[PDB]
Amino acid sequence: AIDENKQKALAAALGQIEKQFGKGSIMRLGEDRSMDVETISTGSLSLDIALGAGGLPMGRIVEIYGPESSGKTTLTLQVIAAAQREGKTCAFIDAEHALDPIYARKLGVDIDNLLCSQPDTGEQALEICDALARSGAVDVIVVDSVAALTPKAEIEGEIGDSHMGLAARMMSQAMRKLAGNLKQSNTLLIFINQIRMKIGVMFGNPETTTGGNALKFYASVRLDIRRIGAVKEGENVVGSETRVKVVKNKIAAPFKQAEFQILYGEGINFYGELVDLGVKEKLIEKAGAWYSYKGEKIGQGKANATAWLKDNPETAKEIEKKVRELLLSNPNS
Amino acid sequence: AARMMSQAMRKLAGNLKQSNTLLIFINQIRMKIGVMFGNPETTTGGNALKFYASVR
Amino acid sequence: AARMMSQAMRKLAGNLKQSNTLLIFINQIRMKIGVMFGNPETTTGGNALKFYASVRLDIRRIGAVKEGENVVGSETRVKVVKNKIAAPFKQAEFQILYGEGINFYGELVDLGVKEKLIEKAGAWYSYKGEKIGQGKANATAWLKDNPETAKEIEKKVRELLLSNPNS
DNA sequence: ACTTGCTTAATTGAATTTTTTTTTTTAGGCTGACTCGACACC
DNA sequence: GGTGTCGAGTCAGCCTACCCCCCCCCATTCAATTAAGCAAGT
DNA sequence: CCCCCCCCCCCCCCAAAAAAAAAAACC
Numbered sequence A: 001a002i003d004e005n006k007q008k009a010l011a012a013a014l015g016q017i018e019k020q021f022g023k024g025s026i027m028r029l030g031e032d033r034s035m036d037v038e039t040i041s042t043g044s045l046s047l048d049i050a051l052g053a054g055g056l057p058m059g060r061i062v063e064i065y066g067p068e069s070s071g072k073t074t075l076t077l078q079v080i081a082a083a084q085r086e087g088k089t090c091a092f093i094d095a096e097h098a099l100d101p102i103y104a105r106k107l108g109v110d111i112d113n114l115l116c117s118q119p120d121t122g123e124q125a126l127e128i129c130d131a132l133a134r135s136g137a138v139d140v141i142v143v144d145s146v147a148a149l150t151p152k153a154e155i156e157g158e159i160g161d162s163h164m165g166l167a168a169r170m171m172s173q174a175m176r177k178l179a180g181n182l183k184q185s186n187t188l189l190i191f192i193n194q195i196r197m198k199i200g201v202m203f204g205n206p207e208t209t210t211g212g213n214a215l216k217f218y219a220s221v222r223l224d225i226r227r228i229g230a231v232k233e234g235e236n237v238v239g240s241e242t243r244v245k246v247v248k249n250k251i252a253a254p255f256k257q258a259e260f261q262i263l264y265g266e267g268i269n270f271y272g273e274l275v276d277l278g279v280k281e282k283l284i285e286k287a288g289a290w291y292s293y294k295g296e297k298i299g300q301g302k303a304n305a306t307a308w309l310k311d312n313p314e315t316a317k318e319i320e321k322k323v324r325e326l327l328l329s330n331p332n333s
Numbered sequence B: 001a002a003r004m005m006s007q008a009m010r011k012l013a014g015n016l017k018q019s020n021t022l023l024i025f026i027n028q029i030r031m032k033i034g035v036m037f038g039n040p041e042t043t044t045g046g047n048a049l050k051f052y053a054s055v056r
Numbered sequence C: 001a002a003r004m005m006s007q008a009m010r011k012l013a014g015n016l017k018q019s020n021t022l023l024i025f026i027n028q029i030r031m032k033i034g035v036m037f038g039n040p041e042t043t044t045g046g047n048a049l050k051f052y053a054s055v056r057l058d059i060r061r062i063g064a065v066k067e068g069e070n071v072v073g074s075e076t077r078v079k080v081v082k083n084k085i086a087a088p089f090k091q092a093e094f095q096i097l098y099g100e101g102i103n104f105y106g107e108l109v110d111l112g113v114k115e116k117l118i119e120k121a122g123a124w125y126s127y128k129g130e131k132i133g134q135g136k137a138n139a140t141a142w143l144k145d146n147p148e149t150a151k152e153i154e155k156k157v158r159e160l161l162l163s164n165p166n167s
Numbered sequence D: 001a002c003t004t005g006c007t008t009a010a011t012t013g014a015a016t017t018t019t020t021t022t023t024t025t026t027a028g029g030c031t032g033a034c035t036c037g038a039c040a041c042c
Numbered sequence E: 001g002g003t004g005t006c007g008a009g010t011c012a013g014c015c016t017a018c019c020c021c022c023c024c025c026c027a028t029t030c031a032a033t034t035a036a037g038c039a040a041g042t
Numbered sequence F: 001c002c003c004c005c006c007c008c009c010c011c012c013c014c015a016a017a018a019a020a021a022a023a024a025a026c027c
């Protein structure tokens, strides 16, 4: 008796809300396809595993932070390169004024279709982000350094002048405005941030990021990237040994980490990863310092084993297919 | 209230002068809103009393 | 809302006086922003109630009351910010204990010490030589057990500090 | 009977520095900028 | 025929009317220091 | 005895509401 009266009052209210605000304003969460999480590759297989859902989520905000020369720009360009290869449009907002277009081409970016902007102010940078988000025509936006998003008042002003929390306020306002626009357009926004030291602290770590506290809350993923060593061809340093910690994750379990090589002028070493994962999943046998695939000695030393996998495009397909099958915990589709 | 004050001033001003009686009105401040230029402080009971007052 | 409150006061002030009825309005605090003349703490509902009020009390929590670790109440301060029936700007300090209310015996200690009926050496409370406890809580706990001395100290404090007693 | 360490509570001090600017809800005038027709002159 | 220039018309943004009330502001936590009373040693 | 004719003028305001936000090593 009361059941029917409640179901009718509910049905009437739902009808009135959908009339006043629009069609999909309120609905049951189980029958809402908009809310399903879709992901894209990072151009690193170990990082796609660490993220738990096979890559970075569309319609969300991501933060990548780290020290100087850690690989923050190189990593965001490999994301763009991968996205372009699946026929997606990408934008680069270069607030640092430090992008080399020749190096971007060497990492596999289609330069001639990559939208670029070198804005004057933080406001202009973030108004271009909102304009491209509302359009529905851009799939990935990268904002290179939050640290270089200078408010207009600070550019007009003198060096030494105080602007209390003015960048932090700008970023707080930006997040509020963007979150909704990005979810509707299914657009991925990636923010790069720099590290700074906070003083008057003895608990926790003294490392901070720039641009205040809003971005920590709204980010669905946060990556801490670091250079942990060198890659040498005898004497010549030819690349960096890199580590990425997943510091925040809302689309899968956090605190996982990824290890890989960045080689100068190539990018992330995909086959270098595919060796290490093939080893861990018992598909490649490392008998001391001798890498072996089904008895056949593919080489000795990681570089020779990688060079062998490069020469055999069938054996690389085989191992990738198995590793993808096994380790990807939440496959999206 | 503005009308009642308007009518009272008309009636009282002449009766006070004849009898030589001092009449003191106390008023409270309110805040007039939708004013940018100047002082947003008003008093109560309309405009008549400003005109008929010999001292404010 | 400011208009409604302005209209309400006009109507109520006279009706309350005839009936001899006490009306108490509780108000919340809000922040005034921009170009501020004075303190940025405001109250809600416009400017009428400030004029019509015969008494205005500002109440504040100034600390915790702890039984070792367990927080068992609040230390409170009340400022008299407006008064038309006696002189203003006097203040009161008392304890609110959760589930009991205002700690009457705690006030009686503090008023006993002020009017020399109780002797306080460091943190040692003495009534006519006899030592009644160390610390305000043990002193209070004694006065709770000895209602003869409580009634005596109350009667003397009322005689001293309350100017005109009851009818 | 004289002196000292322990007890329990309450009191006071430091905690590196030092800093900003904005709205909706005006009304009516003044400045500068853009549009268009066309008339003088090479 | 085309470009500079005279002229009327229309539109977007700024600013100036304006005096200027305050009576002085919302407040905390850990730990070193002080001290009156009382049991233990002499 | 016999039979109507015609309008005139406004008056007064009332009330506030609300925060937002870090930035940086030094030997």
Ligand SMILES: Nc1ncnc2c1ncn2[C@@H]1O[C@H](COP(=O)(O)OP(=O)(O)OP(O)(O)=S)[C@@H](O)[C@H]1O
Pocket (backbone or CB within 6 Å): A067, A068, A069, A070, A071, A072, A073, A074, A075, A100, A103, A240, A262, A264, A265
């Ligand atoms: N144009 C280039 N040619 C060769 N190597 C490069 C080039 N640009 C960057 N690298 C190297 O790639 C590695 C990572 O560089 P990035 O990806 O630019 O790092 P990053 O964190 O953006 O550092 P910033 O912005 O300069 S603090 C470093 O060892 C660089 O020296």
Ligand SMILES: [Mg+2]
Pocket (backbone or CB within 6 Å): A072, A073, A074, A144
């Ligand atoms: Mg960079």
